[PDB]
Design a protein around this ligand. Structure first.
Ligand code: NI
Length: 341
C-alpha cells in the first residue's frame, strides 16, 4: 500500500509510486527520474499514463520496454494541463532527466515536489520566483549539519588533475571509473576529455547513455574497449580483486590502474579537504573515493527552504525512524525561527 507522502491531495496523482499495484484513485503516475528505488515496479506490462521528462521517457521505452502509448513526456519550464490540473516540470540538478514538479491545485494551493535534487541558488530564478508555495515534499537525504561536501566543480578539478598527472607520468596507466545507475557522468567524461580518449564501456551501459540527450555523445563514448584508456565498470568491481582481473583482460597494454569511486558523502568528509584526499593502494592499483554528490548538502538545503518559505514541509527521505523524523522536524523549526516565516 502506497504511503501518504507519495500522494498529491486534491488530485488523482501519485509521485514515484509504481511498486504498490493499482493505486486506488490514481489517474496519472508521475516519475521524477530514472533511479531504481523510484521506478520500482514499472515494466512493459504497465498500462496507466506515466508523466515524466523526455529523457526519462527515452529510458522507460528502451531500458524497461514500457509501450509508447503510455509514455507522456513533458517539456521543462512550460505550463501544461494534466487531467484538468496545471503542472510545471523544473530541472532538479540531480541525474539526467531528473525533475521537480509544481502542482497548481484546483482550490488555489501550490505544491512543489522536489523528487531527488541538489539545491542551487539558480533555482531562485526559475518559475518558482513568481508565486507562493504552500506545501514542499522535500528530498531530505542529507538533512543534518555533519553532511558537508565540496562543489561538483572542485571535485571534477581534483579528478582531472589527478588523472592527467598519473597518465603523463606513465602512459601505460589505465583509468577506470565505477558506475551502477545514471548520474555523475561528468566524472568519466571530464577525465576522458583531458586524456584525449573516448570512454569505453559495455553494450548495456552504452545503450543507457545513448538515451540521455548529451550533446555530441557519439564523439565521447564507445563499446571498443581496445581503443579507449578510460574504462567504465560496475561499482561492485571497483576493488583490488576486480581491478586485478580487469587488467589481465587488457592483453599487456597496461601495467597500472588508477580507479575512481564517486560516492556520496562518507565520514572521511568530516576531517579531510578535497585537496588532501589520498587513495588506497595495493601494488600497481590505486583507488580514490571522491565525494561527488547529486543531493543537497545541509547548507544548500537550508538556503533553498529559507528562500522558498513553505507553510508545510513533508520529508520524502529518512522517514522510517522516529529519531530521523524528530531530528528533521527540529531543523525545520530552527530554519523558520531564524528566517521569520
Ligand atoms: Ni535519485
Amino acid at each position: 500500500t502506497c504511503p501518504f507522502y507519495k500522494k498529491i491531495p486534491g488530485t488523482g496523482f501519485t509521485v514515484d509510486a509504481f511498486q504498490y499495484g493499482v493505486v486506488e484513485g490514481c489517474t496519472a503516475y508521475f516519475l521524477t527520474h530514472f533511479h531504481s528505488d523510484h521506478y520500482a515496479g514499472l515494466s512493459k506490462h504497465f498500462t496507466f499514463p506515466v508523466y515524466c521528462s523526455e529523457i526519462t521517457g527515452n529510458l522507460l521505452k528502451n531500458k524497461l520496454h514500457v509501450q509508447e502509448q503510455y509514455i507522456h513526456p513533458l517539456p521543462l519550464d512550460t505550463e501544461c494541463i494534466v487531467n484538468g490540473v496545471k503542472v510545471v516540470l523544473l530541472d532538479a540538478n540531480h541525474c539526467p532527466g531528473a525533475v521537480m514538479i509544481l502542482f497548481y491545485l484546483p482550490n488555489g494551493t501550490v505544491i512543489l515536489h522536489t523528487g531527488d535534487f541538489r539545491a542551487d541558488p539558480s533555482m531562485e530564478r526559475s518559475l518558482l520566483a513568481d508565486q507562493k508555495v504552500h506545501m514542499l515534499y522535500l528530498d531530505t537525504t542529507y538533512c543534518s549539519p555533519e553532511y558537508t561536501f565540496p562543489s561538483q566543480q572542485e571535485v571534477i578539478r581534483f579528478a582531472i588533475n589527478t588523472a592527467f598527472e598519473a597518465v603523463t607520468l606513465n602512459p601505460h596507466a589505465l583509468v577506470v571509473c565505477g558506475t551502477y545507475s545514471i548520474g555523475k557522468e561528468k566524472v568519466f567524461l571530464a577525465i576522458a576529455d583531458v586524456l584525449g580518449s573516448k570512454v569505453g564501456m559495455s553494450q548495456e551501459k552504452y545503450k543507457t547513455l545513448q538515451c540521455l540527450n548529451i550533446p555530441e555523445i557519439n564523439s565521447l563514448i564507445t563499446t571498443d574497449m581496445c581503443s579507449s584508456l578510460v574504462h567504465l565498470l560496475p561499482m561492485m568491481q571497483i576493488n583490488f580483486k576486480g581491478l586485478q582481473s580487469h587488467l589481465k583482460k587488457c592483453g599487456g597494454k597496461y601495467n597500472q590502474i588508477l580507479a575512481f569511486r564517486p560516492t556520496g558523502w562518507t565520514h572521511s568528509n568530516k576531517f579531510t579537504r578535497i585537496a588532501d584526499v589520498i587513495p588506497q593502494t595495493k601494488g600497481n592499483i590505486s583507488i580514490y573515493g571522491i565525494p561527488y554528490s547529486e543531493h543537497s548538502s545541509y547548507l544548500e538545503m537550508k538556503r533553498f527552504v529559507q528562500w522558498l518559505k513553505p507553510q508545510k514541509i513533508i520529508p520524502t527521505v529518512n522517514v522510517g525512524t522516529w529519531k530521523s523524523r524528530s531530528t528533521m522536524e527540529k531543523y525545520f523549526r530552527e530554519w523558520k525561527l531564524e528566517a521569520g516565516y
